């Protein structure tokens, strides 16, 4: 919720979009076409994986029995051992739940962030030839074909080719 994109001004996500986290749905003369963006999907996935590899780490640290399940140790040292172990259980349990809540906040805002980085980029591409309607869409103010779409996608769309055209239409 940090950036306003996901669960913000985009109303929802597309259950039909199997092949990415982020993508494009366009409507022009020819038809309607959908394709998921690679560069930013990969980008997020890679940060999630980098989180995992950090926690899925194995502690190389060995501990032995100070205790005895078969013949109980003497009672005073038994009680110190148990009280310490419980105190450690407190620390680790707090650490566990904190670490996980925090990673989750960050993962969610990581996602909001990359959406709202796809957006702001396409916006920058199109310069003055289209408009923010505000549901995560650009109304294009010139007729455009499906090879014009692809050129937005793979980031080649030239603006000063369609500039004048789309400007009187505003």
């Amino acid at each position: 919720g940090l950036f306003g994109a996901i669960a913000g001004f985009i109303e929802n996500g597309w259950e039909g979009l199997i092949d990415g986290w982020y993508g494009f749905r366009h409507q022009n003369a020819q038809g309607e076409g959908t394709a998921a963006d690679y560069k930013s999907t990969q980008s997020a996935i890679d940060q999630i994986t980098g989180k995992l590899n950090r926690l899925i780490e194995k502690t190389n640290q060995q501990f032995e029995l100070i205790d005895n399940e078969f013949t109980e140790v003497e009672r005073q040292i038994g009680n110190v051992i148990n009280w310490t172990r419980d105190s450690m259980t407190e620390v680790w349990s707090y650490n566990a739940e904190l670490l996980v809540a925090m990673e989750n906040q960050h993962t969610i805002d990581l996602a909001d962030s990359e959406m709202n980085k796809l957006y702001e980029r396409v916006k920058r591409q199109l310069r003055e030839n289209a408009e923010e309607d505000g549901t995560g869409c650009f109304e294009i103010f010139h007729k455009c074909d499906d090879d014009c779409m692809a050129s937005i996608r793979n980031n080649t769309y030239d603006h000063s080719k369609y500039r004048e055209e789309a400007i009187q239409n505003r």
Partner: nanobody
Amino acid sequence: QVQLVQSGAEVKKPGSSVKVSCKSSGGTSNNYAISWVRQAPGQGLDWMGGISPIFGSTAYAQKFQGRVTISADIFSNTAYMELNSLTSEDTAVYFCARHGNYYYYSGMDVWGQGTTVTVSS
């Protein structure tokens, strides 16, 4: 550089199951798709399915749907393929390979050395 090391050769009786592993060494493949592709003797390559474990995708070829289970342990950097209800039609070299990205469209540029599975009496 990463290498994908598959498990040993297998000899199986009809109706049994086989589970082959593919270990990513010299680094993790968890951020990529890994597919399983088999080659029956004298025949061409045939896709079985794949898994992209951080992404959360497991995909299966229709012709093997229901008989194969593909999985991964992100923690040991290992992918697995288990094929059930084996017959002599399944005698073939199974190959695990890594895709240049998280999904199955990109060319597979790393591969396993291959596992031979023999189904016979």
